[PDB]
Design a protein around this ligand. Structure first.
Ligand SMILES: Nc1ncnc2c1ncn2[C@@H]1O[C@@H]2COP(=O)(O)OP(=O)(O)OC[C@H]3O[C@@H](O[C@H]2[C@H]1O)[C@H](O)[C@@H]3O
Ligand SMILES: Nc1ncnc2c1ncn2[C@@H]1O[C@@H]2COP(=O)(O)OP(=O)(O)OC[C@H]3O[C@@H](O[C@H]2[C@H]1O)[C@H](O)[C@@H]3O
Ligand SMILES: [Mg+2]
Lengths: 79, 84, 75, 80
């Protein structure tokens, strides 16, 4: 059981994290830097910020919204 | 404009903003799953399965960067939306 | 069923809403004024709470899927 | 303190925090405990209230706070 602060630092360093308290299964977060996104996103418009994604239960890729439940929780772990 | 009306404008591909925001010249824009897949990827090597995105809403922020838009309670409840 | 815009007005009118597409069951949203804080210790906005799958009350944070979805229903 | 994880610990101890990089000036966050919330709202004594983070905005409005991803990743947090 990691705090959100611990999970956050690990996410910053390129690891994947998740909460056991989430309802959906097999989900996780991953962080992409501005440089990574400048290459990955080919759809035209220039400069991305850092974006955290959540791989969801249906295996789709979404933007992760930091819920208060998530940020206050201490049930985080590393994939 | 309510947020419900701003959402309908977003789903039509146009850009929306709140006057009550602090940062200037910001706006939201929506990219669909099909749009995000178009020319997506590092382009070197092959995925087992092509990534499938959900819809993503971006915000063009006051420093002219592109971020993921987190819908705030203030945003969602506000009545000060407009089209760019 | 309902759009998020419709769910928001139902919330403002004192009813409870949820998405049928959520993973967790037995959850819902409800809205109150934050002016209940005035007695503690400014313009008070409304607050959207979530009653969670593990029976807690938190301040709700919409995902992008939540606000784009058309599967909202009334409790 | 600097990171968001540190700011959350400051919030939990009852102090106020802000980001110097925010566009709005003189804003801050504060956290109310389950006990304080149940007393204020009249329910959730234990369905039980959790903690809730609020924001006082630059226009003097009070809302439940929603973190942006930039907020959570930022290192410019400070104590009021
Ligand atoms: N298809 C998704 N698209 C975007 N984002 C998603 C998806 N799927 C999951 N998320 C995010 O993971 C968190 C935990 O997942 P979860 O426990 O399974 O959520 P849920 O039961 O479906 O309820 C929903 C509430 O959860 C909170 O955080 C959720 C979501 O932010 C939110 O406030 C939700 O309103
Ligand atoms: N570089 C950004 N990166 C990501 N997201 C951003 C950025 N810049 C702006 N946003 C988003 O637009 C909203 C309105 O913009 P804003 O009025 O100028 O925000 P603010 O004064 O800087 O921060 C105070 C609070 O605003 C709320 O919504 C903000 C942000 O979600 C949040 O809860 C903030 O914690
Ligand atoms: Mg590219």
């Amino acid at each position: 059981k990691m705090s959100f602060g611990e999970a956050l630092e690990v996410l910053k360093q390129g690891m994947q994290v998740y909460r056991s308290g989430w309802n959906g299964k097999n989900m996780f977060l991953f962080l992409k830097s501005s440089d990574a996104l400048a290459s990955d996103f080919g759809f035209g418009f220039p400069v991305f910020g850092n974006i955290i994604f959540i791989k969801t239960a249906d295996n789709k890729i979404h933007a992760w919204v930091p819920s208060q439940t998530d940020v206050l929780a201490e049930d985080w772990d590393i994939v």
